[PDB]
Symmetry: C2
Subunit: 288 residues, 2 copies
């Protein structure tokens, strides 16, 4: 049985991603968010509710990526160096999820927080979207998997990392780009820096598997991929309508969702499916 041997490279990229994960390491104790209270209380009731709801959704996606998406993909890799990278990325999703709790503690009472998590658990669109992604992961709960199954779990993972988070990341960035909730915005920026490398790395692993599939299997997963993209898009459009109508931002968020969907396709080596539009300028300032 093989031990991981970093003296003999298994690919040309795992070492660089391993080092970059670690170079980017952080935890929530590094960013105090109490100073956000001054701008939090200036938000309207509707703005505050939207913020808490999107944070709840982000927490769900990180919970499932750390607890299903990374572990179940990694188990089925033959490349022990790439497995190492995914184990660390999965741990970072748990750091991310805990950081949302750290933000919540400043922004809400204990009772308000538990309300948000009950709203998350019972939310039908969050249940639907998480169910779609995790179905690909849970297919891997068996000793022998096909390359089509593993590839599609990697596609679902890239779509979570590079696409499904972004209807939520929009609002912390949009507020921070205006000088509101800037400390929480700094945390979200650290999370995004991690998710961006996660999506690139899993997309590299997916492209490697794709190249090994027969032409017939390639056709089949290309179809599944394009269908999954649009199945998720329909849910995302319903989610943005629900969250952002009250604050007048639906079309701006939708534009941001499409921009990030294109990035996820690119991470898989695929052509964009939505027209190119420039990112919202305030969001761009929030990333700065």
């Amino acid at each position: 049985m093989r031990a991981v041997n970093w003296n003999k490279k298994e690919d040309d990229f795992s070492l660089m991603f391993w080092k970059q994960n670690i170079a980017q390491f952080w935890t929530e104790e590094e960013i105090a968010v109490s100073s956000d209270k001054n701008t939090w209380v200036q938000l309207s009731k509707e703005e505050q509710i939207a913020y808490k709801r999107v944070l709840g959704g982000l927490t769900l996606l990180d919970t499932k990526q750390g607890g299903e998406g990374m572990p179940l993909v990694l188990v089925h890799l033959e490349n022990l160096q790439a497995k190492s990278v995914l184990a660390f990325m999965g741990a970072m999703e748990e750091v991310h999820a805990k950081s949302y709790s750290h933000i919540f503690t400043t922004l809400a009472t204990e009772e308000e927080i538990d309300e948000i998590f009950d709203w998350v658990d019972t939310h039908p669109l969050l249940e639907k979207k998480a169910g779609i992604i995790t179905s690909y992961y849970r297919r891997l709960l068996k000793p022998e998997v096909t390359k089509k199954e593993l590839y599609m779990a990697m596609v679902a993972s890239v779509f979570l990392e590079s696409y499904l988070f972004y209807s939520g990341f929009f609002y912390p960035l949009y507020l921070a780009g205006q000088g509101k909730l800037t400390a929480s915005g700094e945390i979200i920026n650290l999370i995004i820096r991690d998710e961006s490398i996660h999506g690139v790395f899993v997309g590299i692993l997916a492209q490697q598997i794709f190249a090994e599939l027969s032409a017939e299997d390639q056709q089949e997963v290309q179809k599944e991929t394009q269908e999954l993209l649009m199945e998720l898009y329909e849910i995302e459009m319903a989610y943005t309508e629900e969250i952002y109508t009250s604050i007048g931002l639906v079309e701006d968020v939708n534009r941001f969702v499409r921009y990030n969907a294109n990035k996820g396709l690119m991470n898989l080596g695929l052509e964009p499916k939505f027209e190119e539009e420039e990112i919202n300028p305030i969001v761009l300032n929030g990333l700065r």
Copy 2:
């Protein structure tokens, strides 16, 4: 679907272990080991071979714990806070595994390193012991697991964490306690500090599951755990004879194995099975 909510504790211990994992965070870049070359060359060929072989075995065990033991147990754990802790522990196993490669780079040529990893992969006792442990993990590759299956995976995990590593950790500690290979010894001591908390934590989780089992299931797993302890012990005694007879340390290592087996049992809430014997004084100095 539920998101992890650290504002509502799921148990009385996961937060403390989460914080301690992180407090103990380290990577190999932090300890240069080039200065160990001066004492490395003082060793005989037999001492050097033993050292490289035991590090190879340690690397194998950490590879399997990061790539199978932590991910498959955590996937099936219901408690989302404890799941978070296990994800971090699994990532640390990959840090540990990579740190062995860092030691190897100082102590051996590229060709010698690849020969050690071939010796690991073909080794019959390493294959047997790793296969015994991973057979319990691989039983968890199914959509839903029984509590007996999950408990036995946690037992196997504690036995790896608290027991199987120690026939290997002996030698770096013994040499470091004589002032030899002290930089590598410092790394091993950081690894041990992590494995000790890993074994305590998984043992807490195991005791919780055990107490939820029916009486008939408890009787079954109690017997299986005692058999497993002694099945592994027979293999360990063959391993120590093979590795350490050339350098006269077999009985010393065996005493250390029994000492650590007792600690594994205690981590599971079980009584010691081996006579108490005081720790070797040189090893004790290497831990200091």
